[PDB]
RNA sequence: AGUCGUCUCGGGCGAGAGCCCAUAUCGACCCCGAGGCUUGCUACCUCGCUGUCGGCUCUUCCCAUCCUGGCCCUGCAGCAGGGGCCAAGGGUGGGGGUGUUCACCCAUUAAAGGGGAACGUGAGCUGGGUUUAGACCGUCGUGAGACAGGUCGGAUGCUAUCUACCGGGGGUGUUGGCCGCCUGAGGGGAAGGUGCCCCUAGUACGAGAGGAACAGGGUGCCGCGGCCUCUGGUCUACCGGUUGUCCUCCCGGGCAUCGCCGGGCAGCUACGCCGCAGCCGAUAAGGCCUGAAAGCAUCUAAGGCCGAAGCGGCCCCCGAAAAUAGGCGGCCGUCGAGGGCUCGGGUAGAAGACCCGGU
RNA sequence: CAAACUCCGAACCCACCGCCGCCGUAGAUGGGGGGAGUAGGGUGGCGGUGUAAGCCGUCCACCGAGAGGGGAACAACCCAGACCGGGGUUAAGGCCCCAAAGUGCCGGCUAAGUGUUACUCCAAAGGGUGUCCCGGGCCUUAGACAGGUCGAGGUCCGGGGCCCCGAAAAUGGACGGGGCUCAAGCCGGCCGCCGAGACCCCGGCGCACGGACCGAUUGGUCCGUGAUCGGGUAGGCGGGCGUGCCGGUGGCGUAGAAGCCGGGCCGUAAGGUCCGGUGGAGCCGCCGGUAUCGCGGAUCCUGCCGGGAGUAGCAGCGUAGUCGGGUGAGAAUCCCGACCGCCGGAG
RNA sequence: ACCGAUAGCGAACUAGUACCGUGAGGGAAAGCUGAAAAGCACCCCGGGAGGGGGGUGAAAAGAGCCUGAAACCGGGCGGCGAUAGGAGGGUGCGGCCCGAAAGGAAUGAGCCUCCCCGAAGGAAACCGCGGCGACGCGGGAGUACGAGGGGAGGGGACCGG
C-alpha cells in the first residue's frame, strides 16, 4: 500500500500516474487532496466546476451526475474518469483507492511518497489554483 | 402564453409520511447564556384572548383578538449524558452516560380492590421505549463513567455536550410509554454545559425554569395526517372544464412528447398531512402552573374549558399558552426551541397585558 | 430533415440631418454576418394508417430583457426621456366583438416581452374553424357538376404488457444478532416576489411651473407551509314543524330524494385565522488605487480595493444502499436477548405500514 | 470585354506505323451455338443549371454485390481486397490514462482551455503599441524621441506566424471522455517502440491447366506449374447429401425391426454410423429407373399450448334480506314460521 | 413404379350425418387394448369421484387403452444467484459439476527432467566510436531463442469431450 502526498502535484498527471498504479493491483492512499493545483485561469476552471455541478437530469433530479464539491471527491472523480469504470476490472480498480484532505492520525509517521512526473516546478509559470480553492467556490465542506 | 406561478412548492418534497412520529431538530440556535435550547409539550386545544397590543405595529396599544394554542407541559426527565468529538465529516458521538435506575414518586399510582400500590420506578416506564436497559448498574460504575467523561472532556477530544430528556405523560395521565430526546445546551464552554447537564441529571425540568415569557419559538412537531389526497387538494391545481367526460379533478396533461418521460415536477396524487413540519417565530404568551393561569396577582383562572378540551382531558399540570396555531392532531408531541431566525425588532420579553381569557364550552 | 432567397436580429464605412459638431440621436448609397422564431425551395424518412387549427389543464427551457436588481453615454436642471451594458431568481393579469393565433379596443398595472419543447401536451379534455356523406344562395358549365365563395347540420373507441414519475410495503447486503438516540456525504427550495402610504420634503434642482434621493416606519397583493379559537358551508349523527297515505282512532312508527322545511355540536373545510432572515463570502457590468511597457501619461500587462433581485452559506424539507454501505450507550450469543400473529382502540390508514393500551 | 468572337494556342485525347513490355499453340484476337440477369442506382472529381440544398450529364475510383485494421460511432474517407492451422514483420495510423506503445529529443511560438478536427462537421467583412519575426525607409549612441536642458536609440511604412475582439437558443453534456500550459496545443525536423486476414515462412485442402498409370456409363490414384488461382448480389456451370416407391443384387430382425430421448466417432457440409434406454414387427447397404422428393416466413392452412392472469367482468335501468327450526356428509343460495321490504294501469 | 387417416372421394366410422341460412343453398370433426377380457376377486381410507395394498397379463398395453415427439407446466438434481447494461451470441481460458459404452489410454494420460535438428525471424551483458540529445554504428552474432520434426529417463490415471 503506496501513501502519495498531493502538495504541489498538477492534478491531472498525479490522476494518471495514480490510476495506472491502480490497475496494476496496487492500493493508494492520497493524503493532501487539497493541495493539489490545477493550471489555468481561475475564472474558467471556476466556471467548468460549477457547470458541472449543476448539470443534471431533469425528469429526476435522483440520477443526474453527482459531481463533486469537495477537494477529496474531485481528486477521485478526476482519478476514476481515467479508468475503464463501465467494467469489473475498473471497478475492482476504484475500490482500490483511498482519498483524504490532510494527514490523518491514522497515516501520521509513515513514508509519503512524491512523483517527480508531476511536480510544480516543471510549470513555466505558476499560474493555478488550489483543489481547495476550487472547493471553497464551490461551496463544499473543504 | 398566460404565465402564472405553478401550483405548490417544491421545497417540501418528497411528500412522504414522517419518519418518525417524534419530531427531529436538526439545527439548533447560537445563545450566550447557558439554558437547555427547547422544551417539549403535548398540545391541547385552541382558544382565544383579549390582549392590549405591545408589538410594533399598527395597532399598538389598542385591544386586539388573539387565537392562542395549549401545550399541557409536564416537566421533562434529565436522564442521560452524550459527547460528540469532531469527526472526518460531522460530529460523532464519542460517549453517552444515564444515570442508575431510582424510585419513580410522580407516578399516579392507584389502589385497586386487592394488592398494594404498584410501587413503580424509573427504568420501568423507560422499558417501553428501550427494551434494554442496564442490569446491576450501580452508583460507583456511574460516577467512574462520568469521571471518564470528564477527562475525555478535558483531554479536549470532546467538541460539544448534548442533555438526553424523556416525557412523562403518566404524570398528567395521558399514557405511560415514554418519549426519549436529545437537546443541545446554550454556552460556548464544553465544560460548563458539561457541569450544567450534571447538575441535573436524574433530576426534572420545568418549563418555567427553560423558557421565557414572551420571547419567540420555533415549534416542530408532525402534521395531521390526510391519507391519500389528488392532486386538486395536494398541489392546488385548477378543476378542469365542466364538461369533461374524463374527471374533473385530475390534471389534463402530464408532460410534453420530448422529454419521452414524466418529469418528477408533474403534480400527482400521493400522501398528504403528516409530515414534519417547522414554523417560525411562534410568541410565548404565558406560562401556566399547575393547570392555572395567573392574571393580577389575586385573580387566577382555570386555563380548561367547560366540559374539557375535546378529543383530550382536563390540563393539571404546567402548560403553554402560545399566539397562533401549531401543526399537529390533539394529543401530539410537539417540541418547542427559541427562535432561529428571529427579526429585528422583537416584541418585548414579558407577558402581554391580557384583558379576557375564554374558558367558555369549547364543544 | 438540408438551405436561408425571404423573415428576425447584429456588424463595417460615413454622405447627410443635428445653431458649429458624423457618431446625444437618426444614418442614405454600398458591403460582411448570426438564428432557424415567417414564408418558400428540395423531395432525404414516414401512405399493410404517427388523428388537424384554436381553447382549457399541466410541466419545463433560451435571451435577442417588458417590469423587478446594478450600471455607462446623453442635445442627462429636477420629474421624466433617447441609446447602450451585466443580469433569466420572480412576475408578466382581467375583459368586448371574432372559431380564431394574431391584430384592434376598454379599465387597471411596475410590466401587462418575444419564443423552443413532433407549429409541447386529443391511449388529458372540448369540438367552435378546417376536410366526406344532407341542403340553400351567387358565379361558371348545354349537362352531369364545380368553386383555396359564403351559409345551417354533422360520431372523438382503451381491462396498462415494459418503462416513466407520485406515494405505500417485503427482503438481501453492509464480516454475529437485537432495542434506542444521533451524524449529515449528497439531492430539492422562490420560500419568498412585488406595489402603495407617512416622514426626509414642498427640501435638493429649477426663473417658474413642477419636483427627487439615502436612511427610518406602516401596510396591501401574488406565492408558499400550517390550524379550526372566531365567522360561513356541509353535517342522509341528532332535535322540531308539517303534506299524502298505511299500521283501526290516541301515543309511536313505515314509505314518498333525508318525503319537504328550519336549526344543528364533533369532523372536513375557506369565504376564516396564524407563520415566511437580511447578514456574511467571492463575483459579472461598472467605479477606483499602485505601475511599466512607451524616462511622460495610463484602471492592466504583473498586483490591490470596492461593486448586482444574479452565485455559495446561514434557514426549511428527504436523507445509512453514503460500496470509505457511518457513530455511540445498552442487552444477548459463542437454551436463548429481541420480535410476529392473535386481543381492546385511533394522534394512522386503499392492502401493508404507523400510534396508544393490554391486569 | 465575349458560351453562342478568334490573328494565335497548350496540357491533353484520338487514328495509324516501328519497337520495348505483356498475353498466346497448356490455343489468344476472332467465329458459332445454349442460358440469362440488367431499363429506380448511390458517394466521390469535373461540366451546365440553381440563393443554396438540389436537378441533369460526364469520369469507373469505392458501396450496391466487399471481409479484416482505423477515423468514437459513420456505405462512400485511410490501409486492405479474404481457402484452413500455426510463427514472424510491416501498412493506415498511433505512443499521458481509458488503451499496446515515450509524461521521447532539439529550436521556436501560443495564454486564448485558442487548441487538443487529414475529409465526412468546423463562422465572415472589419479591426488589435497582444506577442514573435522579416523587408524597406527618415532621424540616428553626449546629436535621435518622452518631459532647451538631460543623454541611448528613436519615428514611420508594407508584410509573415500564433493569438485577441467581432461571436445570442431553447431537457443537463460534449476535443470520444478524463484531463492537459518550456504541453498531453501549434509550427521546422528527428529518434525509438507498438500496431492488420496485408508481406514472408512451415504444414494442410480445393481449383485451373499438362502428364503417367488405372476403371465394362459422366470417372479414379499420383505427379508438375500457379508472383501472374481461392471475397461476392442477379445469373451461368460441375459435384455431392437426404426422402417414398419400383427392377436387380447382398443382407439384418422376437437373443428384439421401424419409430422416439440423451451421448461417442467420422464428414469443410448436406449427413452417416455406433453406444445406453423405451418398443413389440418389420427394415436396410450397393447398381439402374421413377416422384404430390427436402421449410422460418406468404398479416400462409389445420391442431395444440403459452405471457396477458388467478387479472377484467359477476354495480349503474327494480341497491334485500334477517332471526329461530328442518333436511342433508356438506347450506348465505333448498324447505316451514315470524319480521322487514319491492311491483301493484303490471313485475 | 398412385395415397396411407391434416394424405386418398367431402365421407376408411350411426357422412351429404351433425350443424349454418327464410330461401336458393353451404357443410364438418371423428381409425388402432391385449394372444386370450384373462376388463382387477378381496382388504384399508373417502360423501362421492376416486387413492393405497393385493391380483391378471411376456409386457398395464387399465378401457381417459399400440408407440407417446415438441410446445407448455410441476418436483429433484448440477451451475449462477439481490453494485450491475446490452439482439442474449463469437475467440481464449479459469472456477463448480458429470464423465461404464461408443473416443485415446497400464502395449502408458495429464505431468516432471534431459538430449538432437530446426524455416521465416531474431535479442542482451560487455568492448570501441559518432551524435547537443532521444539514440545509433562495428564485434559479441546471425549467437540464446524460434513453428515444428525426433529420441531417452521418472511417475503411474487421466486426457479428449
Same mark, same amino acid.
Given at each position: 500500500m503506496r501513501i502519495i502526498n498531493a502538495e504541489g502535484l498538477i492534478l491531472g498527471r498525479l490522476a494518471s500516474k495514480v490510476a495506472k498504479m491502480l490497475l496494476e493491483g496496487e492500493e493508494v492512499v492520497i493524503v493532501n487532496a487539497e493541495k493539489a493545483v490545477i493550471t489555468g485561469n481561475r475564472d474558467v476552471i471556476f466556471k467548468k466546476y460549477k457547470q458541472r455541478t449543476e448539470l443534471r437530469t431533469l425528469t429526476n433530479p435522483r440520477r443526474g451526475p453527482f459531481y463533486p464539491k469537495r477537494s477529496d471527491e474531485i481528486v477521485r472523480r478526476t482519478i476514476r474518469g481515467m479508468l475503464p469504470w463501465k467494467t469489473d476490472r475498473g471497478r475492482k480498480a476504484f475500490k482500490r483507492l483511498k482519498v483524504y484532505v490532510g494527514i490523518p492520525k491514522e497515516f501520521q509517521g509513515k513514508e509519503l511518497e512524491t512523483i517527480i512526473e508531476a511536480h510544480v516546478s516543471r510549470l513555466s509559470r505558476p499560474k493555478y489554483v488550489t483543489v481547495g480553492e476550487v472547493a471553497k467556490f464551490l461551496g463544499g465542506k473543504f | 402564453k398566460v404565465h402564472r406561478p405553478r401550483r405548490g412548492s417544491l421545497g417540501f418534497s418528497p411528500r412522504k409520511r414522517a419518519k418518525s412520529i417524534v419530531?427531529?431538530?436538526?439545527?439548533?440556535?447560537?445563545?450566550?447564556?447557558?439554558?437547555?435550547?427547547?422544551?417539549?409539550?403535548?398540545?391541547?386545544?385552541?382558544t382565544h384572548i383579549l390582549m392590549i397590543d405591545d408589538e410594533p405595529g399598527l395597532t399598538n396599544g389598542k385591544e386586539i383578538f388573539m387565537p392562542v394554542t395549549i401545550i399541557e407541559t409536564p416537566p421533562l426527565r434529565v436522564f442521560g449524558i452524550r459527547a460528540y468529538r469532531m469527526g472526518y465529516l460531522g460530529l460523532?458521538?464519542?460517549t453517552e452516560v444515564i444515570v442508575p435506575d431510582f424510585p419513580l414518586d410522580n407516578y399516579p399510582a392507584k389502589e385497586r380492590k386487592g394488592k398494594p400500590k404498584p410501587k413503580m420506578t424509573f427504568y420501568k416506564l423507560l422499558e417501553r421505549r428501550?427494551?434494554?436497559?442496564?442490569?446491576?448498574?450501580?452508583?460507583e460504575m456511574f460516577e467512574q463513567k462520568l469521571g471518564q467523561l470528564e477527562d475525555m472532556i478535558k483531554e479536549g477530544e470532546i467538541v460539544d455536550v448534548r442533555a438526553i430528556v424523556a416525557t412523562q405523560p403518566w404524570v398528567i395521565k395521558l399514557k405511560k410509554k415514554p418519549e426519549v430526546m436529545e437537546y443541545a445546551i446554550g454556552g460556548t464552554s464544553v465544560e460548563e454545559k458539561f457541569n450544567y447537564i450534571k447538575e441535573k441529571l436524574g433530576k426534572e425540568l420545568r418549563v418555567g425554569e427553560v423558557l421565557k415569557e414572551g420571547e419567540l419559538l420555533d415549534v416542530i412537531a408532525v402534521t395531521k395526517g390526510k391519507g391519500t389526497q389528488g392532486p386538486v387538494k395536494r398541489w392546488g391545481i385548477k378543476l378542469r372544464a365542466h364538461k369533461d367526460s374524463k374527471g374533473r379533478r385530475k390534471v389534463g396533461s402530464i408532460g410534453p412528447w420530448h422529454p419521452a418521460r414524466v418529469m418528477w415536477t408533474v403534480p400527482m396524487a400521493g400522501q398528504m398531512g403528516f409530515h414534519h413540519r417547522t414554523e417560525l417565530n411562534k410568541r410565548l404568551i404565558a406560562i401556566g402552573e399547575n393547570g392555572k393561569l395567573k392574571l393580577d396577582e389575586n385573580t387566577e383562572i382555570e386555563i380548561t374549558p367547560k366540559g374539557g378540551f375535546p378529543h383530550y382531558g382536563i390540563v393539571r399540570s404546567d402548560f403553554m399558552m402560545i399566539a397562533g396555531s401549531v401543526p399537529g392532531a390533539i394529543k401530539?408531541?410537539?417540541?418547542? *426551541? @427559541?427562535? &432561529?431566525?428571529?427579526?429585528?425588532?422583537?416584541?418585548?420579553?414579558? *407577558? @402581554?397585558? &391580557?384583558?379576557?381569557?375564554?374558558?367558555?364550552?369549547?364543544?
Open positions: - | 419530531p427531529r431538530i436538526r439545527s439548533w440556535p447560537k445563545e450566550t447564556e447557558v439554558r437547555m435550547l427547547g422544551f417539549a409539550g403535548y398540545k391541547a386545544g385552541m460523532e458521538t464519542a428501550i427494551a434494554t436497559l442496564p442490569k446491576n448498574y450501580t452508583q401530539r408531541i410537539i417540541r418547542v *426551541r @427559541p427562535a &432561529i431566525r428571529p427579526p429585528k425588532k422583537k416584541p418585548p420579553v414579558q *407577558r @402581554p397585558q &391580557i384583558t379576557y381569557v375564554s374558558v367558555e364550552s369549547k364543544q
